[PDB]
Amino acid sequence: RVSLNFKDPEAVRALTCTLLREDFGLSIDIPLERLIPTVPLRLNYIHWVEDLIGHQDSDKSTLRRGIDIGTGASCIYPLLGATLNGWYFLATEVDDMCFNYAKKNVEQNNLSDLIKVVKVPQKTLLMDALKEESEIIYDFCMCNPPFFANQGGITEIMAEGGELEFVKRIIHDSLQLKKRLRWYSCMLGKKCSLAPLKEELRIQGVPKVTYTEFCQGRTMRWALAWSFYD
Numbered sequence: 430r431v432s433l434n435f436k437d438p439e440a441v442r443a444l445t446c447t448l449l450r451e452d453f454g455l456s457i458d459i460p461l462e463r464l465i466p467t468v469p470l471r472l473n474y475i476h477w478v479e480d481l482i483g484h485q486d487s488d489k490s491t492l493r494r495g496i497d498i499g500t501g502a503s504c505i506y507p508l509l510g511a512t513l514n515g516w517y518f519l520a521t522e523v524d525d526m527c528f529n530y531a532k533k534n535v536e537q538n539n540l541s542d543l544i545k546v547v548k549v550p551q552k553t554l555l556m557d558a559l560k561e562e563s564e565i566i567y568d569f570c571m572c573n574p575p576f577f578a579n580q581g582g583i584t585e586i587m588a589e590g591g592e593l594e595f596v597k598r599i600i601h602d603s604l605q606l607k608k609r610l611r612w613y614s615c616m617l618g619k620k621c622s623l624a625p626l627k628e629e630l631r632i633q634g635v636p637k638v639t640y641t642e643f644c645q646g647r648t649m650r651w652a653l654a655w656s657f658y659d
């Protein structure tokens with residue numbers, strides 16, 4: 430009964446869920462109403478974060494702490510980061526369906542000690558999520574941003590371009606938080622998003638700026654990361 434045509438979301442969901450069970454021992458339940466993550470592309474981003482935050486010798490090994498902005502119903506970045514690397518995550522969500530599924534997915538995989546799923550107000554991002562945080566420095570923030578039109582026949586094109594305004598909000602919050610987080614990062618869907626974002630960091634005098642390209646056959650993605658550390 431499960432479709433063999435990989436253009437059908439039922440086949441993409443079955444493949445994601447099977448891959449996670451077989452390769453990572455992670456059993457997840459996700460709705461067809463929400464974005465279905467593709468594991469290879471999610472892994473590329475986790476590995477890029479490993480490289481950014483640096484390697485530790487046994488004597489200097491610590492618990493790494495990260496924030497996932499918009500964790501989705503799958504809670505895919507925290508589930509992978511926690512399972513593969515033992516990383517701690519603060520995983521945020523504004524969507525109620527996504528929040529319930531993410532919380533349930535963390536519980537069914539007994540990862541509540543490493544992943545804290547939180548429902549945040551729609552107007553909030555990083556600043557509010559870290560309300561009066563003065564005990565720890567987070568190693569990273571990561572984000573697969575939503576496609577909001579403004580926040581018609583060209584609604585899709587408009588929604589895709591809404592990625593730029595969402596990343597600009599992460600940049601805005603980073604200018605206030607600064608060294609509270611070591612690396613700020615975001616995944617980009619369009620190559621044309623990179624140039625205006627790099628320029629916005631340059632004019633704001635952000636000392637460290639880096640970027641990469643993730644490729645999974647047909648699908649091409651970019652990621653941008655920045656830091657206030659010298």
Ligand SMILES: Nc1ncnc2c1ncn2[C@@H]1O[C@H](CSCC[C@H](N)C(=O)O)[C@@H](O)[C@H]1O
Pocket residue numbers: 464465466498499500501502503505506521522523524527549550551552553554572573574575576
């Ligand atoms: N301000 C905000 N804070 C937290 N989550 C937000 C948000 N605005 C939107 N979101 C959520 O961000 C998500 C973007 S889709 C990315 C889902 C997941 N990280 C993946 O890679 O598959 C959506 O689930 C949306 O509800």
